[PDB]
Amino acid sequence: SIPLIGERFPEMEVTTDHGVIKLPDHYVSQGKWFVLFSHPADFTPVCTTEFVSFARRYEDFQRLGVDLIGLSVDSVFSHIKWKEWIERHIGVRIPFPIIADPQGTVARRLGLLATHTVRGVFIVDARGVIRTMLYYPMELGRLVDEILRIVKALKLGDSLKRAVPADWPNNEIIGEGLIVPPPTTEDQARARMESGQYRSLDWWFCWDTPASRDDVEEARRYLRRAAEKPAKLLYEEA
Amino acid sequence: SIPLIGERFPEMEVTTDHGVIKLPDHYVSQGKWFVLFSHPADFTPVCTTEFVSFARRYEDFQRLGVDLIGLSVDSVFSHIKWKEWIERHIGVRIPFPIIADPQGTVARRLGLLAESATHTVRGVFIVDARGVIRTMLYYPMELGRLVDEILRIVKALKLGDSLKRAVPADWPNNEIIGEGLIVPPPTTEDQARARMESGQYRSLDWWFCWDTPASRDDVEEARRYLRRAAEKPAKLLYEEA
């Protein structure tokens, strides 16, 4: 039984390889967002490639006030030995904590559970509310740059009181334009149309460009990198 | 109470603006994959952009064997008037069917609805030709989806099934192995020992083995999706009207 967007993140005590912490409070108290990502088992390739990819984009998340937290169905001693392997054989240190979940208690609480079903991403805001859930299969690696676009676009929508269009900031229709939430009454719709402060197709489709050039380009930067062909792969220099 | 990944898509009969069809049978019959995407309501701005995003990428989906089908909490008549408006004002036809879901029965069945919600009624179901749910994505109503990622998912997943491979993070642009694909790790020691003795794959450990079996067409197909996503489109559709 998975949680829903809008619901607060289930209050729980968890043991990580950094220590015991209480969720979502550990991050709410700090005024930080956090992204939780689950993993079927330790010493597995796809999950490892995700750790690395997350760690390579660690400062981007810190820059966005987002903390990272992993989830795996293995002991805390396996978790440490696993991070120790990646830093030694791949050359990348994994900074963020990983929740040690024997018995699969935490995964059962989140509705992720087989053990193969234990995947998915929880994007939680600074209020402690679940904002986005992704559920990739264990045979497919996630795109961490899209997760970055999600937290970015979501924070801009919050602070500017705007909805975010498809493929933003590269929308086919309005590009980098941000959608003004539609009117829910007759009077509001009639008022919106008369004011002439918003570009519009119809009363329920109004947009503008309130976002700074910095924030638009920061958002397109993630997609630029994701599409980009990497120079020198990590398996070579290791 | 959602269906988990790996679980078969719930047997149901839905009403669309194209007729009445049974899921997942309708697409399984054709040996097609299908992506189902849900929406809170008709005549909503974010959902419209997503429709146009999907419709502009409709040809890409069909070349992979993926059909498209929408889900919205509104009458079938409302769906058609909505599809009429988009074609007239945006100049883009919506070729795929949309499930008419008044009462929210099929949304409630899939686990997308308590009352007063509909806001929660979103999410993407990527379902393979065997009728099995492969990927679920839950974007909020205030956030337009990245449609090129869905195309990346199906292509990688179809290559995964075909070539018997696990797909690395950021593929085809993985930081460790690039366009390389992961060999499913050994579950026994006698398979781990043999794998290391075989020396057929590039290895990092017994559990971390890969090769490059994907064609240059398959790989460049995947980069084109991500490239399109990253590129600011020359000439917008609002101005064309």
Next chain:
Amino acid sequence: SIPLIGERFPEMEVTTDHGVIKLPDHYVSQGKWFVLFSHPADFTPVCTTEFVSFARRYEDFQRLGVDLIGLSVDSVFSHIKWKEWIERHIGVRIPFPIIADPQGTVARRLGLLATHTVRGVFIVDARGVIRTMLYYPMELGRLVDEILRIVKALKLGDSLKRAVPADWPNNEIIGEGLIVPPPTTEDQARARMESGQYRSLDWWFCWDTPASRDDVEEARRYLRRAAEKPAKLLYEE
């Protein structure tokens, strides 16, 4: 389960194209009756004719202190877009609010639930009590002039303390007259017959003519309008 006559209208909060309102609280506070009519779907021809019909008789309802309120199992956005189509293509403005009922919560609470079942007129008094329920099928459009006759007669019945006869004010027996509520005791029955106060056919059948000439002809007006062939239609112009 449908909330029967006599029962107070179910306490509920509803979302409309005018805003968020509590029922029956919103209209009770104004000392107003309200007529809640439900519909299965937006952009449907039968419902459209009724919407137009109600709006063309809007002042007739206001004159009686009766507000109108629609119900449809669709989003608020469809509702407003549907009203815009009526105002453009038929050229008739729709003034009353319509409840947006996605998922069909209100309809289920009113027991109108298939979606095909979602049709019913609820006539509620200023005290917030259901007085009449009319259940029409989807393939049939309601005679809106009868709804007008119902409230007018029912308001008269309250103020004048009378029962209203069949086909009023065109009753085959007593015509424009209004019935005195029958005696329920032996003492009441005798005192009625010894008063010589009312016209009578029996102790349980007494009536008089207390309604003003305006009240009577106002009621016949509704029935005549429903009977008269309209001089040139609205689809033409």
Next chain:
Amino acid sequence: SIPLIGERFPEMEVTTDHGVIKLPDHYVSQGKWFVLFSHPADFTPVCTTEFVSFARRYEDFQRLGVDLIGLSVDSVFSHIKWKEWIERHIGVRIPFPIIADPQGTVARRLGLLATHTVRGVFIVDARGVIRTMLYYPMELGRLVDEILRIVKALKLGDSLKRAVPADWPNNEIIGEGLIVPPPTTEDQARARMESGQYRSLDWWFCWDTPASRDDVEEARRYLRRAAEKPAKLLYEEA
């Protein structure tokens, strides 16, 4: 817990002052529509006026293939005495049967239960399916001519495969016209518009005039009778 519109009339045996009949079988056997109308009690003024009104319109219902049947929460002997009073005083005979339902069994099975609640009209087709339900309060006499209009419109709708506009045959928009049931697919809507066989406002609003001069004039005749003041009232002639 009422029987919904479009449902089959509840299977039951009832006692009338005509005898015992199986509902709705008795009328279905004949291929006849029937209107069941309930009443709180015998020897009640409003119900008496209602009986007289149904009585003066008896042959109209027969021509439409409709039988009438009343329901009152009193005994059968009370029913016969009630009918007898009406003939002796008002002059009009009551031909239709009345269900004697003490204990309120039939009234309860139909979800009409105080006893003041026992009001309601059931318009049921030749297939024993409920088509309309009207709930007037005990202090308000029904407009019987409206019931005649309902059946007529309903009968023309079924045969011609058309839906009936509001206020028909005097609809403000389309007049004596009838609605062509709306398309449910994209292809149905396109094919309807390219054919151009109906007068139209939109793909979902098509209509024609398939009703005969006589059918229309019969419906307006019901509405005119209801509208017109009766010359000669029944009370005057002792």
Next chain:
Amino acid sequence: SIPLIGERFPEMEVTTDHGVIKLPDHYVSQGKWFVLFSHPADFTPVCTTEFVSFARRYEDFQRLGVDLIGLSVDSVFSHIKWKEWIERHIGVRIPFPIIADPQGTVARRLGLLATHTVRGVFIVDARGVIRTMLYYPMELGRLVDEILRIVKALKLGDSLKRAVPADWPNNEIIGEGLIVPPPTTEDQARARMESGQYRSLDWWFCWDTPASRDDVEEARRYLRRAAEKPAKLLYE
């Protein structure tokens, strides 16, 4: 699931052709006994004969401090019309109230429920306690004089602290005698036989004649009226 003998009459608010009253309160308030008699339907021959019989014995009941109340599964308007027919065609006015029981609420609460089953007499004292219940079939009219005997016997029994023999005051063993309630201990039984203050047959069978002449004669009058063919019939 009828009420039992000795059990208090079920509390209820009922609707009559005389108004709204609460049972048994309405009579307990007046310090009166009441006889409740149920009927299947209005405008029925046997019930009509019963109504008239109670009405002709109305003075006899009131003098005993007993009110009469009817029960019929029909509306209040039928009841009034029914009473009207009786005063007109039989020339006897029916004075007592009739409970209007549509839905058969009261009938069900008293366990009389088919509707044909709705029959039964309840004799209830001033304390509101049920003392006697007769259940006659609907095809058989009641012997109203026997209800009067029953009551008269109970009122004397309560006040004289005595039990009443079969066929009183015309018992084949003890005549118009009345039974002294039997001993329940051996000390009581010994003291009864030692006292010799009662005409006796055994220690458990003692009687005397504590009822007055006028009480006994009033009791034979009821049975005398029941026994005799009435001079002058009412239908004539």
Next chain:
Amino acid sequence: IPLIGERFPEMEVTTDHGVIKLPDHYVSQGKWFVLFSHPADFTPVCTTEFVSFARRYEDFQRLGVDLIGLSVDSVFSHIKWKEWIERHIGVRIPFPIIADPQGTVARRLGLLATHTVRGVFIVDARGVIRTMLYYPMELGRLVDEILRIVKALKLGDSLKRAVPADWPNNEIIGEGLIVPPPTTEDQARARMESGQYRSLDWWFCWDTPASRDDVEEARRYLRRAAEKPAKLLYEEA
């Protein structure tokens, strides 16, 4: 408790005459039976009634009715109690008495305290309960009235007639018997058109089909009930 119209509950009972099945034992003889119940043996009011029943045993035989008692005591108590009556009162008690220790038969019949164990069940030859009477313990039954009930019922069954109040001394119609009212409109017409019965109304029709014997036999019972007894039984001993 069992009701009027319902069949007497199937049961095996122990009496001082033996073990019998009820109501089978009496149905198998094509006989009516009157079951009367008593709180306890060696009790006064019950003894007077036993005597009263025994002194009328010929009148019950003459109607094809059998008597059967019920008391919450053992069979041995029963037989000793019958001995006492026979010795001290000089009257034989011929009818069986059910031995009901534990009160199982009383409980099933709803007679249950043990003081509430009183009731007369008149059951016809079909095993159907036709009448119930419940007197208190401080009151002796009027046994002649039971005799009137069975006679009238047997008369009513054979002649297809209803029996009026106080019969055969009814104040309206005397010894006349009531024709069951018509239930339909056509039955009501054909009744008043035939003129085969005396009537006050279509629902109130009667005739006099009871023979002079059946009438006077019924009047007998009431006369004996009203008669002051010449020579008392306690004096004879």
Next chain:
Amino acid sequence: SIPLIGERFPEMEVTTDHGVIKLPDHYVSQGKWFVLFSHPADFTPVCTTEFVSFARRYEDFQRLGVDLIGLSVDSVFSHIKWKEWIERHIGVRIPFPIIADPQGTVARRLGLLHAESATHTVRGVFIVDARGVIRTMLYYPMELGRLVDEILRIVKALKLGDSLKRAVPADWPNNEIIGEGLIVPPPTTEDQARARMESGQYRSLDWWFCWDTPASRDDVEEARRYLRRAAEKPAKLLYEEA
């Protein structure tokens, strides 16, 4: 569902031919033991003999502070008439009260009735001490009359055991092993048994088998007088005397 030994006698009000009493309150507050004996019906032969046997042993029971009380599934009126017949025909007055149990309410609670249509199972004997505690229960069938002198032996030996803080051997006071001796309650600990053998205050067969003879010459002979009466053919029968 029956009560067991050690359990307190169930609280209840009963109706007797002596009046209404509470059990065991009525006898507890007197310091009296009571023997409750139950019968299926009145005017039955086996039960009558038992009633006579108790009645002529009445003085023996009263000497031991023991009261008698009968229980029968019949009315209180059948009870008094049944007592009258005995006093008139056998010439023996029945002094103790009999409980009247129509409905079998009392017998059902005591577990003398479990299923249906029995009364036959109503044949129990309950021996209750002054603390209101069930001490002995006897269940003889209806076709077998009890041995009343055994009930006297039980209460006498039990009263001796309570006071002298001893256990009573088999066949006492004519036990094959220790005769009229009474058993010292066996040690329940290791050093209790050691101290018992170190004391030498008791005749012994083992640490758990120790006894003395604290019972009075009168108490032993009274107990033997109960058994002699049981054993001896009575001179002059009661049917003969009637």
Next chain:
Amino acid sequence: PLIGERFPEMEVTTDHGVIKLPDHYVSQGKWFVLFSHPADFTPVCTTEFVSFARRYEDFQRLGVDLIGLSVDSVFSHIKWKEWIERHIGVRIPFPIIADPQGTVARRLGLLATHTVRGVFIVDARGVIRTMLYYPMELGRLVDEILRIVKALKLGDSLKRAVPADWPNNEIIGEGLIVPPPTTEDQARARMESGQYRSLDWWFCWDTPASRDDVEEARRYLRRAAEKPAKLLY
């Protein structure tokens, strides 16, 4: 259980082996007396064992087999018998059921352990005919148990009820009661015939038991009253 009920079908482990109840004895056409004990190596329970064993042949004469029940191991049971035979010099012939867990006791409604007492007297049909519940502080009177089975056998065979204190009843002595008439005609015919002495129609008796049978019953009660010559200690 109750009187009239058949003995509960159970399989028990005793110190002579595993036997089926009540089948082992029913199939032998034998009565059995089952007496239960709280604990082994206990004085009162020991004195009963001796009293039962010295009367072993008397039960054999009546066609009665004996069986003990104790909440202890089978190995303890045998050591307990071994002690009696060595110290008291009386061999215990009857089997004792080993009931650790007190399972058999639980099924028999004897369950504290103090409550684990009671004699079940069971006929050759497997029907419980008598139940005796003595407290643990008081030893039984085995001769009465003998009198019970003896009276019941005569009661069955002669179709008679046994009076109180028989064969020493104060009213009828060694007389045996005829089961009372249940009907009035039976009660009527009983008094008319004159085949029985009587006090009433419900109180009839005769002396159909033989002198041997009467004297054999009195032997039991005489033995219980006799002061023993030479105590076993």
